[PDB]
Design a protein around this ligand. Structure first.
Ligand SMILES: [Cu+2]
Ligand SMILES: [Cu+2]
Ligand SMILES: [Cu+2]
Ligand SMILES: [Cu+2]
Lengths: 276, 80
């Protein structure tokens, strides 16, 4: 399974990815990923139990969540893998990601409604069901709520941080995980959510298919951090209240630990990953 | 200490806040009587589920960001 930069997909690969995503939606399987995600967004807290977000297990949790989704896509078309969006490189509304043959573009100015591409509400193929804002169409405002996506220099400054995470293991932490997540510092992953806008700015962000491509690139940046820091590893490593330690199992699966997810190559490789 | 309560009409929507599937949960916000899930971050900023990735300083600011997000639309209640 090779996860490819979205910018590099062939037209056949874009077609097959879109068709597989639309079939998971039609069959009812897609929306349960959205619902699981929002339940962890609302439950992960800085002063209580935290698993999917604002915590060291943000990275392995999303790695397993994306693997579950990729496996669902491969049950519809075994050739499909999750592409990744390098938003430090493909940083304008003109990127091919946002063309009508892939994810469609930004929302129109009055209501945020996406008007083109396969996920536009007018197609009848992308109802927004699991939602908090009651409107039922995909919305985006690319660049509307924050001026710029992160740059490669900003990504490199976060990749240089040697500690994986640090006490208190939450949104106040220094260290790599929280700078990648974006609650402190120049802000990588959270700012991308804000830049897309629409459902991507909410706890039901997996309503936009770009969610998966954003997280596939966040996941690639974890793999890049590990190659840069082969001497550094997941923390904490035992007996931490409310935080998933290295060898502790993680909800909702309960049958997998961060330790089982550190090495992505057990599951997929990237088109390119520079080596250490 | 919890933030103070508030009650105003913001952009034609009634927003209310008060000290009190999702977390437990020390402050409640409502938009036209529908409860909006909100959360406080360790640095004292706030977010809501409809503007989750963009911290703002106060629960009233989170309620106002939700009204801005909704563009007039009703809020749906959250599970539980
Ligand atoms: Cu998430
Ligand atoms: Cu995310
Ligand atoms: Cu070396
Ligand atoms: Cu809650």
């Amino acid at each position: 399974t090779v996860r490819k930069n979205q910018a590099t997909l062939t037209a056949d690969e874009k077609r097959r990815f879109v068709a597989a995503v639309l079939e998971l939606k039609r069959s009812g399987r897609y929306d349960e990923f959205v619902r699981t995600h929002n339940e962890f967004i609302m439950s992960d807290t800085d002063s209580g139990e935290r698993t999917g977000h604002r915590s060291p297990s943000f990275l392995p949790w999303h790695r397993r969540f994306l693997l579950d989704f990729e496996q669902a896509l491969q049950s519809v078309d075994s050739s499909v893998t999750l592409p990744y969006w390098d938003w430090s490189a493909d940083r304008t509304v003109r990127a091919s990601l946002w063309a009508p043959d892939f994810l469609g573009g930004t929302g129109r100015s009055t209501d945020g409604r996406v008007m083109d591409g396969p996920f536009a509400a007018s197609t009848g193929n992308w109802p927004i069901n699991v939602r908090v804002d009651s409107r039922t169409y995909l919305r985006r405002s690319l660049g509307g709520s924050v001026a710029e996506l992160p740059t490669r220099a900003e990504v490199e400054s976060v990749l240089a941080i040697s500690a994986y995470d640090l006490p208190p293991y939450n949104s106040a932490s220094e260290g790599f995980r929280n700078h990648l997540e974006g609650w402190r510092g120049v802000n990588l992953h959270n700012r991308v959510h804000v830049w897309v806008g629409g459902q991507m700015a909410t706890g039901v962000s997996p309503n936009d298919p770009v969610f998966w491509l954003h997280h596939a690139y966040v996941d690639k940046l974890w793999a890049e951090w590990q190659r840069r820091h082969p001497d550094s590893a997941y923390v904490p490593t035992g007996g931490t209240p409310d935080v998933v330690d290295l060898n502790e199992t993680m909800k909702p699966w309960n049958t997998v630990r961060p330790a089982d997810l550190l090495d992505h190559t057990a599951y997929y490789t990237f088109d390119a990953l520079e080596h250490h | 200490a919890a933030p103070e309560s508030f009650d105003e009409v913001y952009k034609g929507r009634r927003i209310q806040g008060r000290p009190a599937h999702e977390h437990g949960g020390g402050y409640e916000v409502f938009v036209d009587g529908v409860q909006l899930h909100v959360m406080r971050n360790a640095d004292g900023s706030w977010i809501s589920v409809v503007s989750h990735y963009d911290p703002v300083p106060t629960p009233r600011a989170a309620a106002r960001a939700a009204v801005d997000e909704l563009q007039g639309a009703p809020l749906l209640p959250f599970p539980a």
